[PDB]
From Swiss-Prot, chain B:
Quaternary structure annotation from Swiss-Prot or TrEMBL: Belongs to the multisubunit FA complex composed of FANCA, FANCB, FANCC, FANCE, FANCF, FANCG, FANCL/PHF9 and FANCM. The complex is not found in FA patients. In complex with FANCF, FANCG and FANCL, but not with FANCC, nor FANCE, interacts with HES1; this interaction may be essential for the stability and nuclear localization of FA core complex proteins. The complex with FANCC and FANCG may also include EIF2AK2 and HSP70. Interacts with FAAP20/C1orf86; interaction is direct.
Location in or out of the cell: Nucleus; Cytoplasm
TM helices/strands, residue ranges: none
Post-translational modification: Phosphorylation is required for the formation of the nuclear complex. Not phosphorylated in cells derived from groups A, B, C, E, F, G, and H.
Portion of the parent chain present: 415 to 473 of 1455
Protein name (Swiss-Prot/TrEMBL): Fanconi anemia group A protein
Task performed by this protein: DNA repair protein that may operate in a postreplication repair or a cell cycle checkpoint function. May be involved in interstrand DNA cross-link repair and in the maintenance of normal chromosome stability.
Gene: FANCA
Related illness: Fanconi anemia, complementation group A: A disorder affecting all bone marrow elements and resulting in anemia, leukopenia and thrombopenia. It is associated with cardiac, renal and limb malformations, dermal pigmentary changes, and a predisposition to the development of malignancies. At the cellular level it is associated with hypersensitivity to DNA-damaging agents, chromosomal instability (increased chromosome breakage) and defective DNA repair.
Length: 155, 53
DNA sequence: GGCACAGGTTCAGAGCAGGCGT
DNA sequence: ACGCCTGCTCTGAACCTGTGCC
């Protein structure tokens, strides 16, 4: 999770200030691939919701709870990657939606399993890995953009 | 067969199948029902091992 | 009937109000 | 009336109950 966050943020830095030489051109495509294959991996590839019920006593449910938080963070760093590269591409905003759809499916699943026991699981209320930078620039464009060239992709 | 469905490769599967078939000449059916018991229910953890089979 | 927020309660100790030797 | 010791008052922390809602 954090490693993807690190690579993403270093990557954005590298594009922005350094460029104005094979490793980064590779890494762009690494992430693009990781996105495209993560898009169509529906938790039976990661053994979740049916093969696991994330029971925090069992070694399997605890391992599910570890890998689940990894992928939630992973999805988020890719939300960042997707948005960052492209100047408002409606394909890549659908990519962002799909990463969130995976994260949000893990969200409402872990809400179902947190609805039975007491609300002591503050591991689900662990911080996002996003630079505040991001939360600003996302919210900027979500609430304060009337630019019609962006507007179809932000809808 | 374990190696073959861990990697989900048909080459070693085909080898094992033809091996048991020539070993028969109903030992094929014996080995098949042995597979059906706690091998063929989960060849791989993913149920695409069934699709390759 | 269970699921959840708010209240008050017991604690546990810091740190100073004041009774008591010369 | 000044020095010495103690015990009381405040302060917040954590505990678990107590009651309202669906």
């Amino acid at each position: 999770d954090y490693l993807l966050c690190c690579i993403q943020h270093c990557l954005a830095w590298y594009k922005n200030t350094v460029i104005p030489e094979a490793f980064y051109e590779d890494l762009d495509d690494i992430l693009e691939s990781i996105t495209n294959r993560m898009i169509k991996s529906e938790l039976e590839d990661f053994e979740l919701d049916k093969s696991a019920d994330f029971s925090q006593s069992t070694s399997i449910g605890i391992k599910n709870n570890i890998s689940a938080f990894l992928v939630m963070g992973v999805c988020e760093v890719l939300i960042e990657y997707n948005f960052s590269i492209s100047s408002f591409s409606k394909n890549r905003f659908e990519d962002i939606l799909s990463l969130f759809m995976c994260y949000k499916k893990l969200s409402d699943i872990l809400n179902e399993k947190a609805g039975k026991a007491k609300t002591k699981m503050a591991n689900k209320t662990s911080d996002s890995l996003l630079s505040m930078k991001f939360v600003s620039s996302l919210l900027t464009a979500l609430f304060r953009d009337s630019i019609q060239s962006h507007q179809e992709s932000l809808s | 067969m374990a190696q073959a469905f861990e990697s989900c490769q048909l080459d070693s599967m085909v080898t094992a199948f033809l091996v048991v078939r020539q070993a028969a000449l109903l030992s094929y059916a014996d080995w098949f029902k042995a597979s059906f018991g706690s091998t063929r229910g989960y060849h791989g953890c993913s149920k695409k091992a069934l699709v390759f089979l």
